[PDB]
Amino acid sequence: MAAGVKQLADDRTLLMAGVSHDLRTPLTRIRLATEMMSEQDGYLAESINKDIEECNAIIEQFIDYLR
Amino acid sequence: MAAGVKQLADDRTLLMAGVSHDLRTPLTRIRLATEMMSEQDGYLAESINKDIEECNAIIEQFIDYLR
């Protein structure tokens, strides 16, 4: 295949296992951190897992221009 | 200037204001969320602002191959 392409792939799988793999370990430790005060004020606990949901949206929106 | 370049810039300033701008709003809300249990266990509070410090390191290391 003649074309010359070295920056048109390996980004969707490299951006998840690349950044996610590391940003996924902090929500777990803090899962229990906020889970503790999640009783005196469950609010925080969800405020975390929620920022995580937005973390997945930002990854697909910022990856939309990395193909 | 003859060369043809459309993917060799606008990435360092587009990756900070691009991703940071959004990932910086969750540490503030949680700044107070964990700040609450930061007394019954300040540990968590720092566990957050710390993941943030690593958030800046990961951005410069993942940006090192985006020039």
Distance CA A55, CA A3 (A): 35
Residue ranges and CATH numbers for the domains of chain B are: 1-67 (1.10.287.130)
A30 known member of a binding site: no
Look at phi and psi of residue B2 and say left if phi exceeds 0, alpha if psi is from -120 to 50, else beta: beta
- What b-and-e string marks burial along A23-55, b requiring 16 or more CB atoms within 10 Å of the CB? beebbeebeebbbbbbeeeeebbebbeebeeeb
Which ranges in A1-67 belong to alpha helices (H)?
A: 12-15, 21-41, 43-63
Identify all chain A residues contacting B60, using CB atoms and an 8 Å cutoff.
none
Identify all chain B residues contacting A23, using CB atoms and an 8 Å cutoff.
55, 58
Compute how many other C-beta atoms are within 10 angstroms of the C-beta atom of residue B62: 16
Distance CA A50, CA A44 (A): 10
CB A46 within 8 A of CB B29: no
Cα–Cα distances in angstroms (integers) from residue B59 to residues A6, A23, A38, B43, B49, in the given order? 22, 12, 30, 25, 16
Grouping H, G, I as helix, E, B as strand and the rest as coil, residue A66 is: coil
In total, chain A counts a number of residues equal to: 67
How was this structure determined? It was done by NMR
